[PDB]
Amino acid sequence: GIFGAIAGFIEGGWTGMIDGWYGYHHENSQGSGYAADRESTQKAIDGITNKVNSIINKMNTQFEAVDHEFSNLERRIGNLNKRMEDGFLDVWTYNAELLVLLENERTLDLHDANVKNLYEKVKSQLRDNANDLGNGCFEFWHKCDNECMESVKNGTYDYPKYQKESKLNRQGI
Amino acid sequence: GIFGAIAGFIEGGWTGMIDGWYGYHHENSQGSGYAADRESTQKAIDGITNKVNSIINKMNTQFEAVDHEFSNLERRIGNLNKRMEDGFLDVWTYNAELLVLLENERTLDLHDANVKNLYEKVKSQLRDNANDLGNGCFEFWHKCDNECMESVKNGTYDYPKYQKESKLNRQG
Amino acid sequence: GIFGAIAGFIEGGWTGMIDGWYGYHHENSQGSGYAADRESTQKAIDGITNKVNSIINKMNTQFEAVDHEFSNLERRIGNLNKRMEDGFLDVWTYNAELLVLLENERTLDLHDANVKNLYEKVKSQLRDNANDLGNGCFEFWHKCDNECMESVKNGTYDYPKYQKESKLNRQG
Amino acid sequence: GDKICIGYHANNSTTQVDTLLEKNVTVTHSVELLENQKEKRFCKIMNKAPLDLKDCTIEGWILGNPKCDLLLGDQSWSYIVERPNAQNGICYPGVLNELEELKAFIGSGERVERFEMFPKSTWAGVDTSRGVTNACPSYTIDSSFYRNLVWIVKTDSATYPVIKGTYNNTGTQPILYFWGVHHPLDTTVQDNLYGSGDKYVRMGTESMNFAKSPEIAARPAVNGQRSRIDYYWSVLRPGETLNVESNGNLIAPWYAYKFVSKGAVFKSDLPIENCDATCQTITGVLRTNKTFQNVSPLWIGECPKYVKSESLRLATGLRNVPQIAT
Amino acid sequence: PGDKICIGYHANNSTTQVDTLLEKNVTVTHSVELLENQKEKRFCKIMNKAPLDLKDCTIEGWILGNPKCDLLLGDQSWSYIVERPNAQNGICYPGVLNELEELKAFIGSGERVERFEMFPKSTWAGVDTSRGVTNACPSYTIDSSFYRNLVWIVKTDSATYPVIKGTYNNTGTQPILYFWGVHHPLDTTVQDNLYGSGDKYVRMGTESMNFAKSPEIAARPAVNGQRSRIDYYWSVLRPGETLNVESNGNLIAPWYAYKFVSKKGAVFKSDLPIENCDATCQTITGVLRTNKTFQNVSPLWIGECPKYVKSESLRLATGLRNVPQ
Amino acid sequence: PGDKICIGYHANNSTTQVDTLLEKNVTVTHSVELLENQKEKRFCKIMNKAPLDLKDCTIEGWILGNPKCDLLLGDQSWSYIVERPNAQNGICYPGVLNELEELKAFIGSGERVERFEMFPKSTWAGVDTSRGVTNACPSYTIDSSFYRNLVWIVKTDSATYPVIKGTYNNTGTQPILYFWGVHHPLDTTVQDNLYGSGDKYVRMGTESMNFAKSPEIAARPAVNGQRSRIDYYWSVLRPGETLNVESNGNLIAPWYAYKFVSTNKKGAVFKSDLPIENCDATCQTITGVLRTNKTFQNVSPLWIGECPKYVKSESLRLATGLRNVPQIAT
Numbered sequence A: 001g002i003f004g005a006i007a008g009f010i011e012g013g014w015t016g017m018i019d020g021w022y023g024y025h026h027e028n029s030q031g032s033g034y035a036a037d038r039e040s041t042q043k044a045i046d047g048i049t050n051k052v053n054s055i056i057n058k059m060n061t062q063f064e065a066v067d068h069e070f071s072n073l074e075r076r077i078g079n080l081n082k083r084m085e086d087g088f089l090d091v092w093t094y095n096a097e098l099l100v101l102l103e104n105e106r107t108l109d110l111h112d113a114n115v116k117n118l119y120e121k122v123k124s125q126l127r128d129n130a131n132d133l134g135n136g137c138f139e140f141w142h143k144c145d146n147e148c149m150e151s152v153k154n155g156t157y158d159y160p161k162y163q164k165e166s167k168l169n170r171q172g173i
Numbered sequence B, C: 001g002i003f004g005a006i007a008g009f010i011e012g013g014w015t016g017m018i019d020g021w022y023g024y025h026h027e028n029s030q031g032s033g034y035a036a037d038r039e040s041t042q043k044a045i046d047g048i049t050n051k052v053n054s055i056i057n058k059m060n061t062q063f064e065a066v067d068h069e070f071s072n073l074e075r076r077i078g079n080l081n082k083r084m085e086d087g088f089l090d091v092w093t094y095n096a097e098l099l100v101l102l103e104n105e106r107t108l109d110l111h112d113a114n115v116k117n118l119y120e121k122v123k124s125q126l127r128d129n130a131n132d133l134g135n136g137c138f139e140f141w142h143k144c145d146n147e148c149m150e151s152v153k154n155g156t157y158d159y160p161k162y163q164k165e166s167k168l169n170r171q172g
Numbered sequence D: 001g002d003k004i005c006i007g008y009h010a011n012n013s014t015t016q017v018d019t020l021l022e023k024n025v026t027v028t029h030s031v032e033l034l035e036n037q038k039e040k041r042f043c044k045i046m047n048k049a050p051l052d053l054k055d056c057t058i059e060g061w062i063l064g065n066p067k068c069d070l071l072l073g074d075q076s077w078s079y080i081v082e083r084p085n086a087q088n089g090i091c092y093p094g095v096l097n098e099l100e101e102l103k104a105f106i107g108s109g110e111r112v113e114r115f116e117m118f119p120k121s122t123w124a125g126v127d128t129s130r131g132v133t134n135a136c137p138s139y140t141i142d143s144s145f146y147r148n149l150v151w152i153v154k155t156d157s158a159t160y161p162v163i164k165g166t167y168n169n170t171g172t173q174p175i176l177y178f179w180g181v182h183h184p185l186d187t188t189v190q191d192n193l194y195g196s197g198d199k200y201v202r203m204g205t206e207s208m209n210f211a212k213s214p215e216i217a218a219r220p221a222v223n224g225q226r227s228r229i230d231y232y233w234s235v236l237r238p239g240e241t242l243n244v245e246s247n248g249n250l251i252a253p254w255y256a257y258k259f260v261s262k263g264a265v266f267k268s269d270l271p272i273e274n275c276d277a278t279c280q281t282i283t284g285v286l287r288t289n290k291t292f293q294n295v296s297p298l299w300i301g302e303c304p305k306y307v308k309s310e311s312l313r314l315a316t317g318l319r320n321v322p323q324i325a326t
Numbered sequence E: 001p002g003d004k005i006c007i008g009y010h011a012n013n014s015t016t017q018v019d020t021l022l023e024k025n026v027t028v029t030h031s032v033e034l035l036e037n038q039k040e041k042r043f044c045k046i047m048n049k050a051p052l053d054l055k056d057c058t059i060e061g062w063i064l065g066n067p068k069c070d071l072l073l074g075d076q077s078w079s080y081i082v083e084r085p086n087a088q089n090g091i092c093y094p095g096v097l098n099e100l101e102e103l104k105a106f107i108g109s110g111e112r113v114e115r116f117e118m119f120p121k122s123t124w125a126g127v128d129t130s131r132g133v134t135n136a137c138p139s140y141t142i143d144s145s146f147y148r149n150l151v152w153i154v155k156t157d158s159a160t161y162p163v164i165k166g167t168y169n170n171t172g173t174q175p176i177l178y179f180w181g182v183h184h185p186l187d188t189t190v191q192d193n194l195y196g197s198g199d200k201y202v203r204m205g206t207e208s209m210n211f212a213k214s215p216e217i218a219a220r221p222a223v224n225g226q227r228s229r230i231d232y233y234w235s236v237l238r239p240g241e242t243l244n245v246e247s248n249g250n251l252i253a254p255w256y257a258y259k260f261v262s263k264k265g266a267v268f269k270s271d272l273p274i275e276n277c278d279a280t281c282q283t284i285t286g287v288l289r290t291n292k293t294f295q296n297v298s299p300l301w302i303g304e305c306p307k308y309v310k311s312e313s314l315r316l317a318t319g320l321r322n323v324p325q
Numbered sequence F: 001p002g003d004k005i006c007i008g009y010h011a012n013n014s015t016t017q018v019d020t021l022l023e024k025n026v027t028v029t030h031s032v033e034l035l036e037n038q039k040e041k042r043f044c045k046i047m048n049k050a051p052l053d054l055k056d057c058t059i060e061g062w063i064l065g066n067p068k069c070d071l072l073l074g075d076q077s078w079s080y081i082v083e084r085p086n087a088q089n090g091i092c093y094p095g096v097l098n099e100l101e102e103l104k105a106f107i108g109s110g111e112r113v114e115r116f117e118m119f120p121k122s123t124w125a126g127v128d129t130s131r132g133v134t135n136a137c138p139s140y141t142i143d144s145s146f147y148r149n150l151v152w153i154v155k156t157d158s159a160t161y162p163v164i165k166g167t168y169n170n171t172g173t174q175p176i177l178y179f180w181g182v183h184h185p186l187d188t189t190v191q192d193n194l195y196g197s198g199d200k201y202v203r204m205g206t207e208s209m210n211f212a213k214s215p216e217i218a219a220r221p222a223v224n225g226q227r228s229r230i231d232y233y234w235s236v237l238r239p240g241e242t243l244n245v246e247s248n249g250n251l252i253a254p255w256y257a258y259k260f261v262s263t264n265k266k267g268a269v270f271k272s273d274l275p276i277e278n279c280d281a282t283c284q285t286i287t288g289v290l291r292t293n294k295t296f297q298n299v300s301p302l303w304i305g306e307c308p309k310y311v312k313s314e315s316l317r318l319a320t321g322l323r324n325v326p327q328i329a330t
């Protein structure tokens, strides 16, 4: 993946997370679950939808071919019409095919970046209160509440509050 | 934002930073303020300018319609001319409109990338002599003079020089 | 660079690293060397190659001009032919020229990204067992022999294995 | 210890898209933008039926070939369907001049109103009744002629006098009309049919002039005729007037069309059916919301853009990397 | 309490927006509009050269020498032509100017015409040259005149109409645009009165061109009081080419023609004013005075103009997303 | 010292550059040039098939049978046609070859023509077929000749030019391209001399075609010493059709004509003075052969065969590698 998260340092998707594109998986003494991040998911949806609609709108013009006949003394204009029509056809076929290859590449990148940015959003909050396992997972050095998981997700995580417990744990080991 | 900095972990801009695209804001005992990173701001101006001129340059051909007349026995080539002209009009209209949408999306990501790389450039200087908050901001574990700040901006910040002073407070 | 690695926080390339696009330079008591990171360079070669072939394939239709003659009562259709042919010439010239400028920008960015992701990958393995010198260089806080190096390159580095040694040296 | 992980969506989707970098990439959600599907029939467009010329070509309909009487009268069309194998066209051998331009003008139309432009009474001292020919049978009569033309011949005594007619276009609508010049194989047929000496057909309007005289020679037999007819068509603008003057060889305008004026002429075998379409192509109806189609360049109504493309699938979802379950 | 350095980005009072593929109406700090939607509703000089205003005459009226189009008479230089749409004075004696659209096309591609006398009236011997006027072609001062560039030749008061002949050898460097005609009377009475009895012909030829017409007598509907017609013709005598004219009657003879000198030509059919004014890009609907690279005013122009597109705005983001506080 | 591992990238001695939207003259490690700008300034065989070189003759001079063109006289098979810009032998007896652009276009369509006698001189009864030569049309060996494919029929000593008739019937599978003419004398005198007196006509017809023309007698500017002109005409007798020829006088009669093979391949006519050689090509432009794998080309828009897309560009170099930032040595 170009941002390196999707099919990258985060190896796989979650079939379990059915309510979003991007998300959090948590495990705690209370339970374990998959929860989508509403904001990043919705922004991605609004943007991708807009991209599809913009492409559709820019493309809703048509070149119209004609049924006109040409006489045996009209080979040159007849051929002119044919080369003209084929020419526009080739231009538009090219425009759509290339635009689809290009945009598919860029769309997959945009998803990859959104995943990467959520992961970083978490890493900066946790700091050394958690240990980075691979695959985009963090192990807290402290007991983390449901309320605590929510705080990480909604950006409210309190690093000082768990700092002593965490340090004690991190280096008791 | 797509590199996540602009309208992302740095939630807003600075009306106060007047002379650059990409910036530093500082606070210390002496005061507080804004200062552009001239080098990255200029490198972005160069890039964007070159893009704008590349687009202008490539769009610097014209298709010319001619209002030639056609008689009442020339409906076919008359109409051929019309479909032809409107055909190229439709292609160039598409080219310009799509190019503008695409490029606008990408140029915004360029700005985002630049802000993000400036942030990372500072972060990697400061290391553990300072705390990365949420928001592109770093809270020093030491006293940071206007020289100190200027040196952070210059890329000449002295990490050992403050290493012990900051270890202390980071523990204390 | 947009991702900031190439000609960015890593200032220069290596002529020594002959066998790949992206890779490692290592130094240890056993020796010093350059080794390409095979997996990332091969995936980039695949991607760039598909891009080149895609562009070549999409570009594989030709408009055909023709050598037809026109009489002196045929100024309007002769000119129509000329504007038609020139019009397609201008449209294809524009597609190729614009496409090359845009794809060239994007392909450089992709290389920049692969280098930054490689560096980020190692950085995350190493944690605080190593020190960041400048320029994409880590200095280990412990002895790293060739198997240790290989270990980093592979993705299999053992942080617990060296953590006490690197911590003690970090203290010193 | 407690884990928080950051991740992305996966699903059972096996649908793939292509990329400049990569081909056959499975993605969670995607949209196909191109339509490759059609009903193989002709339908109404704007709830207006197409005109089926059936066993008649455009020439056969509009000149009024006698085997085309089903077509005869007023017609309203969303488009014209001309069957490729239609055998009733120009029954009496000859050239319909500016044929392609006529076909284009008829195609620009949506309606024709048939009316008697020059009654047979217009031409005086000449024979109206006689002009018939084995080259133009109806299904009932072996010798007949075009409904829209009169083959005038000299009366039983000599001679063919100068004959004149005028029509003034009082109306709002343009009139599309036809006439001919008869070219006999022989001086014998020429003299038999028409009185002696040089003969002419001359016609005029405010914008137009026409003059021709018979070219007498034997041509290869076509439908039993070594003679030929030169057919002509024109459009009389609203407020314009037509003068016809001749001393011999005139195949006179009789009936003409008030003409009401994008249209198509489809040469096809496809059946017209009791259906509605919003998009109709020469190879069939498109009933789609898609942006692109690969059916046909030639159409009528609102149709998606035509491209040669097999598929145009845009990824909207991310790359699908679901967990392997054994 | 601890000192802080923050990284961030510019913000300004901007309310100017751009669209991207992902988002509409994104306020952006700096931008550049590439499309021009303003024009001066007038015609101006191009390359410091004035346009030719045909005023009340059409192109036909001007080059055939319609008597009411005397203001243009003699030489013309032009950066482009302006034909007023309601122009009244064109072909005054009814009839068809053959290959009209192709003549209109040839003229447009010229810069200049020098009017000269190709065939003096003395060229034709045995015939009257002083009588060929008509009430269909008045000037402003007489009711019966004729095209200045043609002579309507007729029978001298005593029979007959002899074979007339003339030649012009184009010794110059410039092509000659010239005109002639064939008269087609409504009667054999007008035919006999004006020309001889007997079969009339008009034959013309050069090294590369052949022409032969004979009268087609019939009555056509009245236009400008005329049931007769003239078939008018044009052609171009290349440098080094000679024109032989030979006729029996019914020839409307060439009289004055044009040394013709020919970039991009333009015939604007408009009613805008030609003001005292200079320009670099002239559009059929106005002057574009602009540095922008796209325009939405018109596909028809002369000069160096921006490329025409149906868009209403083409604004590139140059700055960044505006998120002020 | 401390143990180092560094992350970095490839560099090399490459001085090759590329452009991007953001930046110009960026030096890169690897790149591909996609445009071709080399040609061989010559004409080669296309589908192992030699083009027709018209040499000193033009297309008219060729298919009318200008007597100075007998080098081209027989059957011809070609992949395209090369016409030298200053070929001197075309229409030698002054006049117009009508619908000429459309003839040049139809000839381009063909890949092969078989010449054959379409109307034997015996066809025309009571008229002289042996006197139709002019000094306007010399062969390289006689100062007075005529087109090898037309008969300038002249009357006999008897004051009458009789009605002459001719039929030909295309029972074969190929269309026949054939020519004829109408003679216009400067004189009523020359008219009388060569043909009858009184109204003259040339009428010809098929199942799908009519033609009638009469003489248009006038003195025109001398060309090849002739103030008289000829109207040449051409047509294509479809398989199964029949040509009927009737004339009163002034007929330049079809004599030899061509069975015409049309072609699946795109066909061309190159006006050019480049040489022709025993070489083979896959792509042939009017200014040269392209021998290339590249996708784009700037040599010409006019070609026959399989050519890269034509563009105005000087160069279309794609970056495949990354920025080249090799170490500075001193």
Ligand SMILES: *[C@@H]1O[C@H](CO)[C@@H](O)[C@H](O)[C@H]1NC(C)=O
Binding pocket: A146, A147, A148, A150, A151, A154, A156
């Ligand atoms: C965000 O997290 C904090 C900690 O869980 C919680 O108290 C707060 O209510 C959350 N926001 C809401 C209201 O969802």
Ligand SMILES: *[C@@H]1O[C@H](CO)[C@@H](O)[C@H](O)[C@H]1NC(C)=O
Binding pocket: B147, B148, B150, B151, B154, B156
């Ligand atoms: C860079 O920072 C130092 C303080 O570390 C300052 O004295 C110096 O003038 C600065 N250089 C520039 C170019 O501003």
Ligand SMILES: *[C@@H]1O[C@H](CO)[C@@H](O)[C@H](O)[C@H]1NC(C)=O
Binding pocket: E013
């Ligand atoms: C915004 O700034 C520009 C220049 O500072 C100024 O001209 C304009 O008046 C300002 N906008 C407002 C609030 O009027």
Ligand SMILES: *[C@@H]1O[C@H](CO)[C@@H](O)[C@H](O)[C@H]1NC(C)=O
Binding pocket: E169, E170, E171, E242, F221, F222
């Ligand atoms: C025309 O004039 C030139 C010299 O002025 C002369 O050489 C040429 O023969 C003339 N052409 C004819 C046919 O009169």
Ligand SMILES: *[C@@H]1O[C@H](CO)[C@@H](O)[C@H](O)[C@H]1NC(C)=O
Binding pocket: F019, F024, F025
């Ligand atoms: C590119 O740069 C070189 C110098 O580095 C210069 O000679 C050339 O003109 C520039 N041209 C193009 C084609 O961009």
Ligand SMILES: *[C@@H]1O[C@H](CO)[C@@H](O)[C@H](O)[C@H]1NC(C)=O
Binding pocket: D220, D221, F169, F170, F171, F241, F242
């Ligand atoms: C031409 O030849 C065919 C084959 O014999 C014959 O059937 C046809 O009658 C001929 N054409 C005419 C009309 O004689």
